Amino acid sequence: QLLFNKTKSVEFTFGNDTVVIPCFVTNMEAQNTTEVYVKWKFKGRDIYTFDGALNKSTVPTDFSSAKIEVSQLLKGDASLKMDKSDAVSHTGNYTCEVTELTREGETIIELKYR
Amino acid sequence: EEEVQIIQPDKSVSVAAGESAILHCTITSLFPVGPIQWFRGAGPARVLIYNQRQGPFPRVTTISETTRRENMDFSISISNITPADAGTYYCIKFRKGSPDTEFKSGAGTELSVR
Numbered sequence: 001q002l003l004f005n006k007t008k009s010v011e012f013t014f015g016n017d018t019v020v021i022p023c024f025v026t027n028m029e030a031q032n033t034t035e036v037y038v039k040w041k042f043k044g045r046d047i048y049t050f051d052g053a054l055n056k057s058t059v060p061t062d063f064s065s066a067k068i069e070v071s072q073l074l075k076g077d078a079s080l081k082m083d084k085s086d087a088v089s090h091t092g093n094y095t096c097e098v099t100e101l102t103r104e105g106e107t108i109i110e111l112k113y114r
Numbered sequence: 115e116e117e118v119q120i121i122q123p124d125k126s127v128s129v130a131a132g133e134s135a136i137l138h139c140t141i142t143s144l145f146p147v148g149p150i151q152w153f154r155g156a157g158p159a160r161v162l163i164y165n166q167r168q169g170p171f172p173r174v175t176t177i178s179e180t181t182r183r184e185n186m187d188f189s190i191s192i193s194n195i196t197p198a199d200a201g202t203y204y205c206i207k208f209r210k211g212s213p214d215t216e217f218k219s220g221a222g223t224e225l226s227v228r
């Protein structure tokens with residue numbers, strides 16, 4: 001498995017213009033982003049997929065803003081970034097799935113809108 | 115760079131109830147990007163026995179150090195075998211996507227209980 005630096009939950013108020021959900025793999029050894037696949041899951045569906053082999057990101061219509069900092073992937077950072085509009089309409093537990101070659105793992109972070 | 119082969123050397127394994135069973139699987143390549151999963155049975159009702167992402171899977175222990183990038187041994191040990199554990203176990207390679215698609219399956223290992 002890929003191993004994670006876990007986080008129970010994060011928060012963001014109305015003042016938070018953009019929302020960041022932390023995901024950090026600790027035993028990542030990817031040589032190129034082509035080796036990497038990232039899934040951010042929410043209520044079953046994939047609200048964001050990064051396909052490194054194809055170098056493409058896929059999002060549904062509701063999640064028009066969701067993206068990650070691809071520059072950070074090789075470091076093991078697959079944190080998710082979205083605006084306030086997408087955040088409020090989708091509040092709950094998030095699953096961060098990362099795959100490197102054949103190794104895979106996931107971890108859960110709950111988004112709270114206090 | 116050649117197409118991965120999935121090798122389950124044992125066509126069949128037998129074991130007394132309450133005891134453990136080793137299910138061997140090795141692959142020849144770590145490509146393409148996507149995980150290995152163990153299933154019992156084939157078809158739409160097959161049962162997920164193990165993967166790296168959705169654990170821990172009680173009763174299932176990995177034979178090798180599967181947190182290592184270069185690991186190609188996906189053999190597992192299943193403890194406390196019951197008659198319910200009987201059937202054919204498939205070590206299966208998947209490609210990433212929404213959803214992940216099955217890329218190639220091992221021959222299968224027939225377990226039976228004494």
Ligand SMILES: *[C@@H]1O[C@H](CO)[C@@H](O)[C@H](O)[C@H]1NC(C)=O
Pocket residue numbers: 032033034
């Ligand atoms: C990553 O892999 C692609 C495709 O194989 C290649 O074109 C690119 O040069 C690689 N990037 C680096 C930094 O090596």
Ligand SMILES: *[C@@H]1O[C@H](CO)[C@@H](O)[C@H](O)[C@H]1NC(C)=O
Pocket residue numbers: 033034055
């Ligand atoms: C990912 O896409 C960007 C923009 O389209 C491109 O500049 C970059 O080379 C791609 N990364 C690869 C091919 O590793």
Ligand SMILES: *[C@@H]1O[C@H](CO)[C@@H](O)[C@H](O)[C@H]1NC(C)=O
Pocket residue numbers: 091092093110
């Ligand atoms: C998030 O998951 C936990 C279980 O670990 C659950 O108790 C909680 O209700 C979930 N949050 C939502 C918004 O469903």
